[PDB]
Amino acid sequence: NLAVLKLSEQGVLDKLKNKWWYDKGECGAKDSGSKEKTSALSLSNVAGV
């Protein structure tokens, strides 16, 4: 119980958490979704014209 707090306060937990969750980002689809309907148009929607 004493050791856990030292690891928590030194941030090794956050380091290991990033190491084993996010640094292995392979299928980085990264779709979140913003409701901001004032997003402009890209050229990629229009280039066919």
Binding site: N1, V4, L5, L7, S8, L13, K17
Partner: protein, 49 residues
């Protein structure tokens, strides 16, 4: 968990209760009924259903 009507902890918690193991570093959720047979440290990683 405990068995129905017998109170026989199978699994890892039984490995702590029945003197077979020594410590369990594992993704293990602090519930109510696990406190009455074994001890937990402070929590290290937070989560939800």
């Amino acid at each position: 968990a405990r068995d129905a009507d017998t109170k026989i902890w199978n699994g890892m918690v039984g490995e702590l209760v029945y003197g077979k193991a020594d410590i369990a570093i594992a993704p293990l959720t602090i519930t109510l009924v696990r406190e009455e047979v074994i001890d937990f440290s402070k929590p290290f990683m937070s989560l939800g259903i």
